[PDB]
Design a protein around this ligand. Structure first.
Ligand SMILES: CCCCCC/C=C\CCCCCCCC(=O)OC[C@H](N)C(=O)O
Ligand SMILES: *[C@@H]1O[C@H](CO)[C@@H](O)[C@H](O)[C@H]1NC(C)=O
Length: 421
């Protein structure tokens, strides 16, 4: 082509931290630049100027992504902690209100068997804490104990002080003294606790795996493409900003190790929104305790119609909005905000003061001040600004465990949404 105009870009180099002593007044005829082009017509940059601007671009990109990722990780992590603390306190406050409510209502006959209810609450609190509880198993044993006690006081005419009660326990497993009320209540409680715990646990893991992405350093191939995009325009005497799509393609390649992680992050956000829909609707733990007295009345009505029938079959064979909804809505909206977080990073990087790429028109496309031919790439394993795969084997190996944990939480969210187990 023709010799570049180094006088038009002398202020740009000084703005990048390069002292005026290092800045060549006339184009340099040496051809030793690693990232910019060194044509026969010369260049306005030296090897030391290129190295300074190279490490500057890598630190600006790593700084911008570190601030974005850690702030998202911190917010989601603290909201998960607030969610768990609210439900944990709501659980303990319920055990007391439930005990006080039934003692004033049913009296000593409840307080005599209050241990059956406190043991159930203890299992429920333990499940939400560590998840090592079979909820349906605990619920079935809960009603089985109620089935046994309801059989003794019905037959106050007889004496059942014997430990032949195992036959009653074994026979009450297949019988339905209260109708379908215990089974319907056991499933709705199990679904609610699984969805509630998984919602907070998946949000915590997403915050943890997001924080671990900070451990992945940019590779040498990223440094080359980054400097050609952001700084090498001034080395040809050009003052225009890089083209937007050109900048986006470069940052996408620098951050290409996040490709799979970005797509699964969207799956995580969609599964979180489904569970949040359940928690605000059918699976809401308030929806199973608000109509609790009518469920008891139906159980008693079913026990008065089937009591004489079951006591004979046993002898045969024996002888204005809740704060829980507020934190769920808060998490749901913020997870909705961070849905496209990873694919938006290249667009976020290309919009700051450090790069400030031009949306055009006249912009630096890597070679000249002309139109950028390529479009924003969406491929997995290629990029127009990179020779081979922009993601190195070392980067994807660091992302492997974070990808596996994120996918693991998506399976639990989907299972919790359907409620099957
Ligand atoms: C047969 C039944 C045995 C006992 C089953 C107990 C089931 C679940 C454990 C308690 C879960 C939280 C219930 C909160 C009820 C309440 O008062 O909430 C206050 C307000 N609405 C909030 O905020
Ligand atoms: C080179 O840049 C200087 C600095 O603005 C300017 O004065 C001069 O006219 C430019 N030369 C050409 C040929 O455009």
């Amino acid at each position: 082509q023709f010799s570049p105009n180094c006088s038009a870009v002398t202020h740009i180099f000084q703005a990048r931290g390069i002292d005026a002593i290092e800045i060549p007044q006339k184009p340099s005829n040496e051809r030793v630049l690693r990232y910019c082009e060194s044509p026969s017509v010369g260049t306005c940059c030296t090897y030391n100027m290129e190295t300074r601007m190279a490490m500057q671009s890598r630190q600006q990109l790593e700084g911008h992504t570190k601030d974005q990722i850690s702030r998202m990780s911190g917010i989601l992590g603290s909201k998960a902690t607030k969610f768990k603390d609210i439900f944990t306190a709501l659980l303990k406050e319920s055990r007391t209100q439930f005990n006080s409510m039934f003692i004033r209502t049913y009296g000593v006959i409840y307080e005599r068997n209050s241990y059956v209810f406190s043991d159930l609450f203890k299992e429920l609190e333990t499940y939400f804490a560590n998840g090592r509880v079979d909820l349906l198993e605990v619920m079935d044993k809960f009603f089985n104990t109620l089935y046994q006690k309801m059989f003794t006081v019905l037959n106050t005419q007889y004496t059942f002080d014997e430990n032949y009660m195992r036959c009653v326990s074994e026979h009450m497993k297949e019988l339905k003294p209260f109708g379908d009320v215990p089974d319907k209540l056991s499933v709705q409680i199990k679904r609610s606790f699984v969805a509630t715990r998984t919602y907070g646990q998946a949000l915590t893991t997403a915050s943890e795996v997001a924080k671990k992405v900070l451990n992945v350093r940019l590779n040498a191939d990223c440094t080359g493409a980054l400097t050609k995009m952001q700084h090498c325009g001034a080395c040809k005497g050009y003052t225009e900003k890089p083209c937007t799509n050109y900048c986006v393609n470069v940052i996408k390649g620098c951050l290409h190790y996040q490709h799979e992680f970005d797509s699964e992050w969207e799956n995580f956000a969609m599964a979180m929104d489904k569970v949040a829909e359940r928690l605000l609707g059918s699976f809401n733990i308030v929806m199973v305790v608000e109509p609790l007295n009518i469920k008891i009345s139906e159980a008693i009505m079913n026990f008065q119609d089937s009591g004489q029938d079951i006591t004979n079959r046993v002898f045969q064979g024996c002888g204005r909005e809740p704060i829980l909804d507020r934190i769920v809505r808060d998490i749901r909206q913020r997870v909705k905000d961070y849905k496209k977080f990873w694919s938006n990073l290249p667009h976020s990087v290309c919009s700051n003061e450090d790069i400030a790429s031009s949306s055009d028109g006249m912009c630096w496309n890597g070679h000249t001040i002309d139109r950028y031919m390529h479009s924003i790439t969406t491929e997995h394993g290629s990029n127009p600004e990179f020779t081979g795969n922009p993601a190195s084997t070392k980067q994807t190996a660091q992302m492997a465990s974070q990808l596996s944990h994120l996918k693991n939480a998506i399976v639990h969210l989907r299972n919790a949404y359907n409620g099957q187990d």
